[PDB]
Amino acid sequence: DDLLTRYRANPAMMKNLKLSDIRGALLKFAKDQVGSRFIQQELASSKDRFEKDSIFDEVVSNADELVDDIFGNYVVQKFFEYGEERHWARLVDAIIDRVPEYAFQMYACRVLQKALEKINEPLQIKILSQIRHVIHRCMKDQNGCRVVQKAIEKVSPQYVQFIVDTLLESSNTIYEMSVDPYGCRVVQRCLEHCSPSQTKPVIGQIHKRFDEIANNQYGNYVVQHVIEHGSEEDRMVIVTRVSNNLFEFATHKYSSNVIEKCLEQGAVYHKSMIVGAACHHQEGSVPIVVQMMKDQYANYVVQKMFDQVTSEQRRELILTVRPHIPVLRQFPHGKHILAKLEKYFQ
RNA sequence: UGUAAAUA
Ligand SMILES: [Cl-]
Numbered sequence: 001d002d003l004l005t006r007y008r009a010n011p012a013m014m015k016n017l018k019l020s021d022i023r024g025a026l027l028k029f030a031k032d033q034v035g036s037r038f039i040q041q042e043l044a045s046s047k048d049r050f051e052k053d054s055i056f057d058e059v060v061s062n063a064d065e066l067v068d069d070i071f072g073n074y075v076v077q078k079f080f081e082y083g084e085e086r087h088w089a090r091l092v093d094a095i096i097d098r099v100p101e102y103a104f105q106m107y108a109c110r111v112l113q114k115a116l117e118k119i120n121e122p123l124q125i126k127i128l129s130q131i132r133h134v135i136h137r138c139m140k141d142q143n144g145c146r147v148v149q150k151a152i153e154k155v156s157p158q159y160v161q162f163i164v165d166t167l168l169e170s171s172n173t174i175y176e177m178s179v180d181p182y183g184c185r186v187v188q189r190c191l192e193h194c195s196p197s198q199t200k201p202v203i204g205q206i207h208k209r210f211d212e213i214a215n216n217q218y219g220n221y222v223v224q225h226v227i228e229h230g231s232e233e234d235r236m237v238i239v240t241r242v243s244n245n246l247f248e249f250a251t252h253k254y255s256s257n258v259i260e261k262c263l264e265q266g267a268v269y270h271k272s273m274i275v276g277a278a279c280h281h282q283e284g285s286v287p288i289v290v291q292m293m294k295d296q297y298a299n300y301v302v303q304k305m306f307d308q309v310t311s312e313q314r315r316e317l318i319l320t321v322r323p324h325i326p327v328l329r330q331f332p333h334g335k336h337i338l339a340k341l342e343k344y345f346q
Numbered sequence: 347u348g349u350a351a352a353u354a
Contacts (some may be wrong), residue, residue: 033354070354105354113352143352217349240351253348297348333347 002037004028004076019051026058027065036071056087063094068108076162077114088119092126099130105294109143116150124155128162135166136173146180152189157198164190164198165201167205173206184218203230204302211240211255220254238262239270244278247288250298259301263308270311278305279320289317291326293338294331303337305343318344 011314138144177183213219292298
């Protein structure tokens, strides 16, 4: 029987097994649940750097078979850790040709993410040179988008310009990514980490189809990131569009969160625009803030208004809603809605 | 009373 069957049989019988004992059994050990845990434990606990190197040639030689294995991917990742710098370059060479497909695989993509998290900028750039070949499809992928997000978090902005240029490759690409469950996460990282010269055309593209993206189940989060990471003029264009169309935005499922984001991140003069729209007379109807309090989504928006505005801005909300309180108690959940506001009407 | 993610 081979070393692994023997070691799996009685684990404690070989409490004195060492990494240099594995030798040619590394592949079988790494693809085995018990074997892989042994290798990992030894790599993390051994103080012998020559033990740790004794298995590295077999890791490199079997790299393609290990990176997308349920148990072997951990073994490969061990050699991208801080403490194995001396191995990083050799290990990138071992996987580089197949990075374009590793990015889509559920185990291998965790190797790529660990590499980008740990390795120096020349090696990151090398990995991204392969990602560049599959970048559009990669951004829309459950696995590939995690690789792209890590690249944006960990590489200097100038070396992800190719990703920004993919978001800008065609008129509708930013829309297509913003409404994709995976592509929307890439747009968000870009907004968080890219330079102002990179984010400005991206935000400009989002603005052109703003109403659709704001009410999309994924796009509303993209718009929320524009509010938080865009410029003052961006917030102003957004607050201005939201104020002018306050009832439409507040009474839809996803765009209602966009208004809440404006209230949390907004300057006093943005809040004042939203409050003024909310309290405007409307000669032939009740004020918009009252209609919103009757609505399944907008009542949370009104609650957020009261919680976020100045005392003087609360004054106008209180003076506008209080006449209509009796009617509002009747409506569905109207009891609870006004209860959560009682502290402002006491 | 209302929204999001790939490993043993
Ligand atoms: Cl998969």
